[PDB]
From a paper:
However, in state-1, the ARD is prominently stabilised in a four-leaf propeller-shaped structure, and the high local resolutions allow modelling of 17 ARs in total (AR0–AR16). For state-1, 1053 residues (88.0% of the total number of residues) were structurally built with 953 residues assigned. The N-terminus starts from residue number 58, with most of the ARs faithfully assigned. In state-1, IFH and the succeeding loop (named IFH-loop) insert into a pocket formed by the pre-S1 helix, S1, TRP helix and S4–S5 linker and are stabilised by hydrogen bonding and ionic and hydrophobic interactions with adjacent elements. Compared with the state-2 structure of [name]-A, these interactions and the insertion of the IFH-loop cause pre-S1 to rotate around the pivot at the joint of pre-S1 and S1 by 12˚. Strikingly, compared with that of state-2 structure, the coiled-coil domain has a large downward movement with ~12–13 Å. Besides the coiled-coil domain, two new interfaces are identified between neighbouring subunits in the ARD domain of the state-1 structure. One is between AR16 of one subunit and the nexus domain from the adjacent subunit (the loop between the first two β-strands), named interface-1, and the other is within the ARDs between two adjacent subunits (AR6–AR9 of one subunit and AR12–AR14 of the neighbouring subunit), named interface-2. Missing of the state-1 structure at the high temperature suggests that it might be a resting or pre-sensitised state prior to heat stimuli. The state-1 structure might represent an initial closed, or resting state of [name]-A isoform.
Residue numbers in the entry:
A (entry chain D): 514 to 696, 713 to 781, 819 to 1098
B (entry chain A): 942 to 1026
C (entry chain C): 856 to 941
Write the structure that this text describes.
């Protein structure tokens, strides 16, 4: 370092003014830095503006590592010396590690030095179009790392006008240019990342709401209603067909009489399954590895096979009914209605109660596999003690088998111990095989299975209802994102990208059109974005 | 309605209707009886075990399947939703 | 600590009961009676209740056995005080 490097590093402005007027020449130090790199490493924005006015060429030359003056002021978090180096016209070039200026501010996690770059007035949308190697999109990297910064980028996408807030020419402009980032066009890129990391403050912001209300009014309100009314034809023609089969079930082998009402219902079922399987086979062609992962598709294959096995005796020459047709009927009627609860998650007033039901069902599968130990622990222990009763009365027959003693143990943590019938009556007439231990395993049963385990499952289903009423706003907004995602995953691209807009101009003083009665019904019982 | 129809399919055509299977011989009666056995009285020994070891239960291995998924979610999972609310 | 620690005292009721269970496989004739059904059921029940003490240390499902063995410590202090009412 020369004394021009040392004086400008410490920011002594009157000394660097003195050395310039007496002809202090300029050259690099051993690192490669000029006097303006060093004054920018420290935060002295009075010495940057002096040196740039005298020697204007040394703003945008690099050291031996390829860093400019903007990288160096970003590597150690001087946000006042970034807003000055960008206003003078720094060049925004890449490092020798191929890592830009905004990269070091989202990699060292400096939220102050990355807010001074993406909120700059002149040069905002030249640092949000860099597309580096470690970060391919700056929008999708601020939502992951620093979500307070991206809330201050959405504030600058809402521009007003200056017309006194109540005149007839006051428009408010929304700009969706950053929520749709071209780098496989996944449908809502910047909102599937808000819900993956769970950012509720970036979904409830008034730019994201108008981005969904642009899509709700466009296409996404008619194609949820037209998915429920197609399923409610398969729902009705299954419960009608199983109800008719139970009356028309006469003898002679057992054989049904194929009337013109169970033959009409068996055709509407078998034609619904083919047309709703050739929608499945299209979705198999692109989306192979989520059929292990997603459950609601796997439910629809047990439903569709069972409804095909149900309708087979309406097509044979004689109606061949047997045990395997009652089995497939009851699985088809039960799964047709349990599928209907998956469509009622998205209603308005009553939708939250199926979110609470399917979250305390996810916990009770992890609990009822861990504490399937205790059912095997007792169910074997009652099979040892209670199976060799010398006269099996039809209350001890439920323990004469190893799988039957595991059902019976599970259906007496629900209340019916039958204490008088199979422990007291069979003891005072000298029939209980091992007396003083049968009252020991039972006395430790009713301490911990119907008291201690059933109060564990109540205490877990109060903490999974409170943690839905807590974050209910995230649960509602994540339904509408995942709705519009898969809806335009299926629509054709030719009249998809011509109906969205890049910017919405709104006039909040003109006489609005009154709401149509068809549109008024669609807003009462659907989770719409119009409830702000 | 999902279970009450499903028990009407499996349990209505028992070849000797004992007065514990008469509550499932009708579609509105199988919707009362399903609602009054999420309150505790499954009657597991009376209408599933006694009528199985004397060869009277019509479809055996599925009647223990709908019942085993009944007592997971109606008298455990639904009745602990109404306590947590 | 054998007075103080419980999981060692469980392992001695388990090991004695499994020895009494296997005695009629070693006698000249198999002498089975009531005391061999008693030791069999305590050995099968305590073999699996010991298995819940190893699942405390798993990742996703381990917290649910911590909750089970903490509401079991309270329900012993309560079901000795309110053994008066019984």
């Amino acid at each position: 370092m020369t004394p021009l490097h040392i004086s400008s590093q410490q920011g002594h402005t009157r000394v660097v003014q003195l050395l310039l007027n007496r002809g202090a020449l300029l050259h690099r130090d051993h690192t490669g830095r000029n006097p303006l790199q060093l004054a920018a490493m420290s935060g002295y924005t009075e010495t940057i503006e002096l040196l740039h006015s005298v020697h204007s060429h040394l703003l945008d030359q690099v050291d031996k590592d390829g860093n400019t003056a903007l990288h160096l002021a970003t590597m150690e978090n001087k946000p006042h010396a970034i807003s000055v180096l960008m206003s003078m016209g720094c060049k925004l070039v890449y490092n020798v590690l191929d890592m830009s200026a905004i990269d070091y501010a989202i990699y060292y996690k400096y939220p102050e030095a990355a807010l001074a770059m993406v909120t700059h007035e002149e040069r905002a949308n030249e640092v949000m179009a860099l597309r580096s190697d470690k970060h391919p999109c700056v929008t999708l990297a601020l939502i992951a790392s620093m979500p307070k910064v991206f809330e201050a980028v959405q504030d600058k996408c809402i521009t007003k006008a200056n017309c006194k807030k109540d005149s007839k020419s006051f428009y408010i402009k929304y700009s969706f240019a950053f929520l749709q980032c071209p780098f496989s066009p996944i449908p809502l890129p910047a909102l599937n990342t808000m819900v993956t990391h769970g950012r509720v403050e970036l979904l409830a912001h008034p730019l994201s709401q108008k981005y969904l209300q642009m899509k709700w009014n466009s296409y996404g309100k008619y194609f949820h209603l037209a998915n429920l009314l197609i399923y409610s034809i398969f729902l009705v023609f299954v419960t009608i067909y199983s109800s008719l089969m139970m009356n028309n079930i006469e003898l002679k082998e057992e054989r049904i009489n194929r009337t013109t009402a169970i033959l009409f219902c068996a055709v509407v079922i078998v034609v619904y399954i083919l047309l709703n399987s050739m929608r499945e086979l299209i979705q198999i062609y692109q989306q192979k590895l989520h059929y292990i992962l997603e459950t609601v598709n796997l439910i629809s294959w047990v439903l569709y096979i069972s409804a095909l096995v149900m309708v087979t005796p309406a097509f044979q020459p004689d109606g061949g009914i047997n045990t395997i047709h009652y089995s497939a009927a009851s699985i088809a009627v039960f799964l047709s209605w349990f599928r209907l609860l998956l469509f009622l998650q998205r209603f308005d007033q009553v939708g939250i109660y199926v979110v609470m039901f399917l979250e305390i069902l996810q916990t009770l599968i992890k609990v009822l596999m861990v504490f399937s130990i205790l059912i095997i622990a007792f169910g074997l222990a009652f099979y040892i003690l209670l199976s060799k009763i010398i006269d099996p009365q039809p209350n001890h027959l439920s323990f004469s088998n190893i799988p039957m003693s595991l059902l019976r143990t599970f259906s007496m943590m629900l209340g019916e111990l039958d204490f008088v019938g199979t422990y007291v009556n069979t003891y005072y007439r000298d029939q209980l095989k091992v007396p003083m231990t049968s009252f020991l395993i039972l006395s430790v049963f009713m301490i911990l299975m119907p008291i201690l385990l059933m109060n564990l499952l109540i205490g877990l289903a109060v903490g999974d209802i409170e943690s839905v009423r807590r974050n209910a706003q995230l649960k509602r907004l994540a339904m509408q994102v995942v709705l519009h995602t898969e809806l335009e995953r299926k629509l054709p691209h030719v009249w998809l990208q011509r109906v969205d807009k890049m910017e919405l101009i709104e006039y909040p003083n003109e006489t609005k059109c009154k709401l149509g009665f068809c549109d008024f019904i669609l807003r009462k019982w659907f989770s719409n974005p119009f409830t702000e």
